[model samples]
Target: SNNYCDFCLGDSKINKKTGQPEELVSCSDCGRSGHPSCLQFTPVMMAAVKTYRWQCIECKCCNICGTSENDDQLLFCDDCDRGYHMYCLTPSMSEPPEGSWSCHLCLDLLKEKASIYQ
Candidate 1:
């Protein structure tokens, strides 16, 4: 049941060679599925999948931007597991934030609480 690639959103019964349907591959980190061709995954990356846990961009999409592309410029929240693009921030981050990061909602809540305390 879990063997189908999440990217294609289809089953593995389709044949890859016949051009009728493509096969599915599973991610070692997220335990999700996707087509190897769609992922642009290389042999080395596949090897890493076997050796260590690896997550795809789809599993790391920014919650703010709602895009899985440009993963190099995205950030993941440590608390809520949400994602944020560097450019999607209100004041657009010039670079990825260091250390544990929180989403806008969490930061707003903290700011509101701090003002109340003051």
Candidate 2:
């Protein structure tokens, strides 16, 4: 599956907890599952594999203007760290957020953080 740790690019097989090298294993979600030590994967992550459906990293990119067109317009949200282009935004802001910016998805998170900033 080429399903190995994207971090070290190490193939499957290792025993992080029990110290017993077994066959290839993987994260049922994102294919970033190599072993815990390489990706600094927590022992708890192995449990998540059984039930959860998600990414190695919690969030990925967003829709609309996925390409880096006007990177200057790309504002990284202080709250979520997600990038949103000015044009792609609902109003295409003349200026970005006042203090630390935030994406629409995490807009409230910015409210939470900006409360601290302002």
Candidate 3:
């Protein structure tokens, strides 16, 4: 119930389009989460998640350090599922963050949208 949308970076409970409490699915491979609407999941994809593990994007290697070392400590961007080594982040932490994380790649897009109004 406390999940967040990777695309919008908002509460998973409320559907921005419908205003109803909605459900979110988590990535089996990387542990990141996103809403069905935000991710535009098809019924087939939704069905597939229950039957098999899904890659919520490629969380294969650390985008910052460019390696897959210390797999357990890799932080996946909720927005893109791009991997980041725990210690390789600009503001690095010793462990995974408390909740949703937006990498600069994702945040910059949001910022660009906002900047157009300024």
Candidate 4:
């Protein structure tokens, strides 16, 4: 779970099955180059990972704008395709909100949000 591909225990790669070489990474979490099985992990890391979609590296998707790169960066909104910086969101003063950071657009269409994730 610390360091590994988040999809099907495969070595992530820029797969070009659809001709878009840059957009075919089957493993969205890791940039490892190979088929979806070159890597290995335990069943604990392979559990339903929608519960684990955040990227562990601070490339372009991290929330904390510093050297801190972990898998829990991109906080996926439960209602939309937009992912937000967990630290950059508006605070509730004492304690943060209890739910995910769904955007305004998502709040408007909660029924159709899951189908539009990027």
Error of 2 at 70 (Å): 0.8
Ranking of predictions according to lDDT: 3, 1, 2, 4
Checking candidate 2 for backbone clashes, the offending pairs are: none
lDDT of 2 by residue, 3-91 (tens): 55544554555444545553333533444455545544333333333332323343333335655456667665543334567778888
**Which candidate would rank higher by lDDT, 2 or 3?**
3
Q: Worst lDDT window (10 residues) for model 2?
A: 46-55
Residues forming the 10-long window of minimal summed lDDT in candidate 3: 109-118
lDDT of 3 at 58: 56
- The true-versus-predicted C-alpha distance at residue 75 of model 1, in Å, is 0.4
TM-score of each: 0.42, 0.40, 0.45, 0.29
**Candidate 4 to truth, TM:** 0.29
Model 1 poorest 10 in a row by lDDT: 109-118
Taken over the whole model, the C-alpha lDDT of each candidate is 0.56, 0.48, 0.62, 0.36
Q: What is the lDDT of residue 17 in candidate 2?
A: 52
* Model 1 lDDT, residue 59, Cα: 71
Model 4 agreement with the true structure over 50-111: per-residue lDDT tens digits: 23343423333533343334336445444322355556555412333464444544445443
Tens digits of per-residue lDDT, candidate 3, 31-56, equal: 77777766775443344344434355
Better of 1 and 2 by lDDT: 1
